[model samples]
Target chain A: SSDPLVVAASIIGILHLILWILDRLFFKSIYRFFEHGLKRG
Target chain B: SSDPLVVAASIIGILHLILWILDRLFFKSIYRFFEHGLKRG
Candidate 1:
């Protein structure tokens, strides 16, 4: 039986996972940049 | 040495972990409910 709801939930989960990854990646870069700035000052 | 950047990163990670958990819990419930309804109909 086809289940759109289940599919939607799975999509949501996948999107969330991607966003979580991006968030971590971006945050790490930002943190490094800030650390560099602090060291420079 | 105290690192505010590390602290902030940890907090964000913790928050993301919580949200990820909530998302899973909620999705599981919703998925089960939809499955139940599909079975009934």
Candidate 2:
């Protein structure tokens, strides 16, 4: 997913993934942007 | 907003703003390809 087309969407996906990891590690919600938000940018 | 149109634009705007700020504040090129990603499910 290095291409912008691939990387573009992947960035958002990855961002949410990292947030989930942080939430799990710290046992807290960092962000819920992907929960249902359409502002996927 | 529940509207996908609004949400999409908002997310793009928000992400760019965030990245710009981070780039300025941290002075790091950071995520040239990936741009930004946290990795979520």
Candidate 3:
């Protein structure tokens, strides 16, 4: 559990893996869509 | 010793899950909120 993130954060040499996943999963598309819409306007 | 922290971390992996159920459920809406504030600062 904790190990996965720690391992991911450490092994992948990117501790923000979870953060990236979270951002992509939760915020990325929505934010992108909004940004895209805003840009077109 | 490491189990609870790891377990908590794993179970709390998804930010959306945290946002939906926990953001307002407790003063410490997210388990790692304090960490984010402290570290991401």
Candidate 4:
């Protein structure tokens, strides 16, 4: 059987990476949207 | 037998706490110093 703490820590690590990457992905898309809109001036 | 991953992760948790505590302490002091220096009114 796996240790609970260890398993949970692994999940946390994975979740952190996923969230970090997902955040960057969406943020970049947001920047692009602002980039397009702000350039119309 | 004790697992290396578990031990490392445990050590990371300790290191994380210490580093985090130290971070807050330093940042609090830094903000305080700047707050004192910045207020002209």
Candidate 5:
């Protein structure tokens, strides 16, 4: 049987990766959108 | 301008907390579900 705490820690590690990717992608899109607007204006 | 590395580190810390909370909640629920099943079975 797997240890629940170890599994929990692994899940947390995966979550951290997901969060980092999402955060970067989100901010990148927003940053590009504003940069485009600035150039247009 | 803020340093991006510092921002990334802070984000990771926040994500860690969020992940920890979610993991605890999810496993706790799952454990309860299985325990209930075992009792009934």
Candidate 6:
């Protein structure tokens, strides 16, 4: 028996994982760039 | 010694602090849903 709720949760988890990785890979530098500039000014 | 590296590390650490919480939320939900199925089936 397929459980749709479990499957939905799995999908959300995987998407969250991807977004988390994306933030680590790319967004970290972006966030820091702005943060560093704004804090100094 | 004052260092930019420390600032960078601080930003990374803050990012990690946030992501870890997000990961916990997603992973916890995913695992709990799976456990529910296992317990039921």
Q: Provide i-RMS per model in Å.
A: 18.8, 12.1, 10.1, 11.8, 17.2, 18.9
Docking class of 1: incorrect
In the order shown, the candidates' DockQ scores are 0.02, 0.03, 0.03, 0.08, 0.02, 0.02
Higher-lDDT candidate of 3 and 4:
4
Candidate 4 local lDDT, residue B12? 76
How much is the lDDT of residue A40 in candidate 6?
98
Q: Which candidate comes out best when scored by TM-score?
A: 4
- Candidate 2 contains a number of clashing pairs equal to 10
lDDT, candidate 1, B1-41, per-residue tens: 23454455455556667766875777774455546545644
Candidate 4 lDDT, B1-41, residue by residue in tens: 75886668754755554553454345555567678889954
Q: Candidate 3 residues A1-41, lDDT tens each?
A: 47565745443333344564555346545677789999999
For TM-score, candidate 1 versus 2, the one ahead is 1
lDDT of 5 by residue, A1-41 (tens): 33554456556667767766865777775455446545654
- Native contact fraction per model: 0.00, 0.00, 0.00, 0.00, 0.00, 0.00
- Taking the tens digit of each residue's C-alpha lDDT, what string does model 2 give over B1-41? 13454456456657756865876786655544233343322
The list of candidate 6 runs beyond 4 A from truth reads: A28-41, B1-41
> Which scores greater on DockQ, model 3 or model 6?
3
**What is candidate 5's local distance difference test score?**
0.60
Indicate the docking level reached by candidate 6. incorrect
lDDT by residue for model 6 (B1-41), tens: 33454455455556656767866777775455445545644
Off by over 4 Å in 3: A1-24, B1-21, B31-41
Tens-digit lDDT string for candidate 2 (A1-41): 24555445545754664553364344323345444465655
**lDDT tens string, model 4, A1-41?**
35777666666666556645765777875455445544652
lDDT of 5 by residue, B1-41 (tens): 65565456555666677654454445555567779999999
In candidate 2, the residue pairs with backbone N, CA or C atoms under 3 Å apart (3 or more residues apart, or in different chains) clash, namely A14-B38, A14-B39, A15-B38, A15-B39, A16-B40, A17-B39, A17-B40, A18-B38, A18-B39, A39-B7
The C-alpha stretches of model 4 lying farther than 4 A from their native spots are: A28-41, B8-41
Predicted structure 3, TM vs. truth = 0.26
